From a paper:
GroEL is known to assist the folding process of multiple proteins, many of which are strictly dependent on the GroEL. GroEL is conditionally essential in E. coli, allowing a facile phenotypic readout of the GroEL protein loss in cells. In addition, GroEL has a well-defined peptide ligand, the “strong binding peptide” (SBP), which binds to GroEL without disrupting its activity. Here, we report a novel PROTAC-like approach for the degradation of endogenous untagged proteins in Escherichia coli using plasmid-encoded Clp-Interacting Peptidic Protein Erasers (CLIPPERs) that directly engage the ubiquitous bacterial ClpXP protease.
CLIPPERs were designed by fusing three different components: (i) an anchor that interacts with the proteolytic machinery, (ii) a flexible linker, and (iii) a bait that binds to the target protein. Using a well-characterised peptidic ligand of GroEL (SBP) as the bait in an XB-based CLIPPER resulted in progressive loss of GroEL upon CLIPPER expression. To better understand the binding topology between GroTAC and GroEL, we obtained a structural model of their complex using cryogenic electron microscopy. The resulting electrostatic potential map revealed an additional volume at the top of the GroEL barrel lumen, in the region of the GroEL apical domain. The low resolution of our experimental map in this region might be due to reduced occupancy and/or flexibility of the GroTAC3 molecule. The additional density attributed to the ligand corresponded to the size and orientation of SBP in the available co-crystal structure. Based on the tracing of the peptide backbone and the positioning of P22 in the middle of SBP, we were able to model the SBP part of GroTAC3 in the corresponding electrostatic potential density. The results clearly confirmed that GroTAC can effectively bind to the GroEL target. However, the XB-linker segment of GroTAC could not be visualised due to extremely low resolution—suggesting the expected high flexibility and mobility of the unbound remainder of GroTAC in the absence of ClpX. Similarly, the protein fold determines the degradation potency as ClpXP engages its substrates by either the N- or C-terminus. Both the N- and C-terminus of GroEL face the interior of the GroEL barrel, making it difficult to engage without first disassembling the multimer.
Author numbering:
A (entry chain P), D (entry chain O): 17 to 28
B (entry chain B), C (entry chain A): 1 to 525
E (entry chain L): 1 to 136
F (entry chain L): 411 to 525
Write the structure that this text describes.
């Protein structure tokens, strides 16, 4: 479940 | 997971086997006549190298206890690597010799603690004798000579090193850089280095050099233990939309904050590389402010309420380059205003003026030197790409060697200095028989590097060792030309720090291995 | 899962083998001449340590019954660790000695219950003799001496400990802390500690120290058994948006409420760490209110209807630091108003004035002391980071040793006190032959630590043990210098509590193992 | 099935 | 008949094992508190003796090299028996002690000839001191 | 001479200063001196006492002081009747030394096949 920001950040 | 436990002689035997395997793999590359070692890669042709570090990196065995031994020796080989910059193979050879003799003595039935005491006493006396034997090298002609010798007898490299150290001082910061034309260029820019390392090896974008290099990056200063990457997010968006790398100087980046940055870097977006804030206490804040005024940025302190997530691009400073090595980071040509840094050094020297204790004067003088020194940039000049890379590697090797030589002087190379030191300590004795046995073990092992060099050359180690011991002074054996002569006169030189560090770390690991009694590993399954 | 069951002699043999393996791994590190133990990690160089706790932690074997034995011995080693703070290796050595002799006697055909009775009687008599032998240590010079001896003969550590205990009393709370400059600093702040532990080890952010440390956190007080993390949610959102840690003092955090917090902490967001509310009955509420007025927060009691989910940040109090160790939590420098705490202590002493029973007076006086005492903060001073860490570790070790010495006095170290106690009980007898055999087993095992220390030193254990037994008083053997002398005069000292606890827990585990008849484990598959 | 709040809480 | 040949450390290890077996069998009978050794005969009850000579006579092992070691020690035990008439167990104990320590030193890496010279010098000095100590 | 291995211990104590030409010779001398205490230790071990303690106690004394294993006590060995001919001890020591030297200098061994 890695949230992805619209600019591409792969938030873990 | 269930553990396998071994005691005493069995553990010692396993460690000795592992050490022998690793040292036999490594030592064949010692000296100018070193052999080739073929290392297998995942694909393609295997790499053929004559470098001890590369060979030692790949070595680790299937037996868990032999793997223990190999890893323990590798640890101090690396420790010697990171202290002086050279001599890993020499340190490994010395460690193997001392460990073999000490384990033989222990199996004979001597007290391991007494053997360790004897080895330590012998090594301390050897360090004293070696310091006595070293000759000064601070003269500029000596600088040129060392630079030439290190860079395969090239005059240009020595001239560049001498010019750089004359222009920025002996202790000044010097950084090598790729040039533009075939002519070499040397200059100074506003910048400085501080002794901090990357939190994880995962930001390394220069695997061959083992360093993190960022070109024209932003710098994020934070006087707070950075965690909760949610706070970090907006500044990373601002940096990434600008297409620049980022260098984070924070008090301490906690968990989930360095892992997230690591994942971002490997995935490709953002080239951030965090680093610890140098210093501690009020000194940490003072030098953070000094870095801020050097780079033209602003220190983002949570104490007054900058609220990290609210930081903008203007808060971050800029610099031409940043290079993060294993233990130090260098900021080169920061965009900070010259007036700002001039005022900062004026303020710090004023603080020196009313400084009360010697500690305050020393620390503030250190800051003054760091701010007002700058860094020298050596632009390597050549025609093509391969010459560019070879020249840069040669210059940086010569820089390391010259820095060590300036630090501690030079001694005869080829293992001659160690042999002379060992001969000078033939009368040293301990408190009992086991201590004397340990002293003799250390003295005998001190001749291992020369014997290994000769053996790689192909001659008889015993004959050459005896001939060298019979002589005196800088008399030694040149393996490149296979002759005898004055080692200093024929250019074979070694920094004192390199040999001292190799000997000291070899002794430390040998003592640790000798006093080892039990070993606990995972099950073979 | 199907179980394997073993009875009698087979189970005893398996337990004895497991105990022997664990004790042989551990005991080589006893005394100043302890050997090194190499422990394998998942990656990198194996760690080399001389600490018994670290070695004992990793030990567990593939055979299920031997694993039983090892785990049972480890349990009381840890129990002795958490009671006095030192002597785990000594306790393990004593336990191994008693277990070996007792199992031999049982196999000979003696009644295990009578052996256990004899061992218990001998240990009780030994505790009485050891209390008789101990000398007081409450004098300030004795405090300085103990602090120096513990911290490798450093005068500064002893001076700091003596100053702290003079300023906040012998029973006052003292906490070590990192300094700013090279000078050490000692002061007192409004705070206190209470005997509660973390619900799970998963909030531990200090693995080396085994404690949960939160810097400038919020505190959530709840006079209710906290469950249904849905109720918890809003306060966690409010805390996380503020970028602060959280410390929860609740009556009891149920399931699904500590697991959720644990998962949140490991994932990175929120640094919450729950803890049980100290006390019980009306005392629990009274001391919860005392903590609230200490931290300036408000107690969130469901009885009147605060409705936990409706709590805000203002309800939560604040403090400079909170440290949660294994069994106690210390709140250091709470933000509560000085007038509020002064009024609270005035109210509690008024309650003392009309207190009827002695229990009420004692309890209210305890609360008064806790509120009006404060905590001493020792700021370790040094130049660099490594010196900071070494100084802090030395100071905290000296603090533990000094606290134990103040609690129960000091006796001769190096196993001398145990030998003297055993010699003083040569005439003790039981009710039958088996009880006398057990008494002799305990007395013989009481000499194991000195023999093990001598064996690690390398001398003959029997000769040195006989020589020490021949002497009297504080006569003993210094292994550091390998000589004989008055143990007290040469600085080798041991807190009475450490030896007493080691002996008592070793005896308890030995009795439990001796009376064991059947063992049930899982199948080897 | 771990519900995630907008501020990141991993509700189990 | 074909021969098996062993060199250096292997031969020393085999000899040491044989010597240890023989000496452990013999030395338990030394002194007034000597233990009993049970020797099997072809028939009837086994003989129980506390005499070192009787025990040493029967000892010889199945491994040829360990048998070498045992026989070499037995030879000088008998030689001491036929010179003074007593002290075979004492001679065997001394031989085992010296052999064990000397083989340990040799495995440590000392020159065997120098060790032999040192042992001979020490024994000569000991004989002189012992002659001095004796009373008429 | 004094029996019970006392004479050998006294002789070994009297030669604590003997040295050879190099380190290996000194090691051999120490090996011989250490082995000279084996009979008393073995006698004590058969008696059931601690060999090291009794050996140290005997070495601490002087003259005919020794340990009677029959009565498990200490005293003057000559006075309590424990006596040993000088020739017996001398011969035992000499032949033990001879066989030890022969075994130490042994380099190769040739035997028949196990079959």
């Amino acid at each position: 479940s890695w949230m992805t920001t619209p600019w591409g950040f792969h938030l873990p | 997971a269930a553990k396998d436990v071994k005691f005493g002689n069995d553990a010692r035997v396993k460690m000795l086997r592992g050490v022998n395997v690793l040292a036999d793999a490594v030592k064949v590359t010692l000296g100018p006549k070193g052999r080739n070692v073929v290392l297998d890669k995942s694909f393609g042709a295997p790499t053929i190298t004559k470098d001890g570090v590369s060979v030692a990196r790949e070595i680790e065995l299937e037996d868990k206890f032999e793997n223990m031994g190999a890893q323990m020796v590798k640890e101090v080989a690396s420790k010697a690597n990171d202290a002086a910059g050279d001599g890993t193979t020499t340190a490994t050879v010395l460690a193997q010799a001392i460990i073999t003799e000490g384990l033989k003595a222990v199996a004979a039935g001597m007290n391991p603690m007494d053997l360790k005491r004897g080895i330590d006493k012998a090594v301390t006396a050897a360090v004293e004798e070696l310091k006595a034997l070293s000759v000064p090298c601070s003269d500029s002609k000596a600088i040129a000579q060392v630079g030439t010798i290190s860079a395969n007898s090239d005059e240009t490299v020595g001239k560049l090193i001498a010019e750089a150290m004359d222009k920025v001082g002996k202790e000044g910061v010097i950084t090598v850089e790729d040039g533009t034309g075939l002519q070499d260029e040397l200059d100074v820019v506003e910048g400085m280095q501080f002794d901090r390392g990357y939190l994880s090896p995962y930001f390394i974008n220069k695997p061959e050099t083992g360093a993190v290099e960022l070109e024209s990056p932003f710098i994020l200063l934070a006087d707070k233990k950075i965690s909760n990457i949610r706070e970090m997010l907006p500044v990373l968006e601002a940096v990434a939309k600008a297409g620049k790398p980022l260098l984070i100087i924070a008090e301490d980046v906690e968990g989930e904050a360095l892992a997230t940055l690591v994942v971002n870097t490997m995935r490709g977006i953002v080239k951030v590389a965090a680093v610890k804030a140098p210093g501690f206490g009020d000194r940490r804040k003072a030098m953070l402010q000094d870095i801020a005024t050097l780079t033209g940025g602003t220190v983002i302190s949570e104490e007054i309420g900058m609220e990290l997530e609210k930081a903008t691009l203007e808060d971050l400073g800029q610099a031409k380059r940043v290079v993060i090595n294993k233990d130090t980071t260098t900021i080169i040509d920061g965009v900070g205003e010259e007036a700002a840094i001039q005022g900062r050094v004026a303020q710090i020297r004023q603080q020196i003026e009313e400084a009360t204790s010697d500690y305050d004067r020393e620390k503030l003088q250190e800051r003054v030197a760091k701010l007002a020194g700058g860094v020298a940039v050596i632009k390597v000049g050549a025609a093509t790409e391969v010459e560019m890379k070879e020249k840069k590697a040669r210059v940086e090797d010569a820089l390391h060697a010259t820095r060590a030589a300036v630090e501690e002087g030079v001694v005869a190379g080829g293992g001659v200095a160690l042999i002379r030191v060992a001969s000078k300590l033939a009368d040293l004795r301990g408190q009992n028989e086991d201590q004397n046995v340990g002293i003799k073990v250390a003295l005998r092992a001190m001749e291992a590097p020369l014997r290994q060099i000769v053996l790689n050359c192909g001659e008889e180690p015993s004959v050459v060792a005896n001939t060298v011991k019979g002589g005196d002074g800088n008399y030694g054996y040149n393996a490149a030309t296979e002759e005898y002569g004055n080692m200093i006169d024929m250019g074979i030189l070694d920094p004192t720090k390199v040999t001292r560090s190799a000997l000291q770390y070899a002794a430390s690991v040998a003592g640790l291995m000798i006093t080892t009694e039990c070993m606990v590993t995972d099950l073979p399954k």
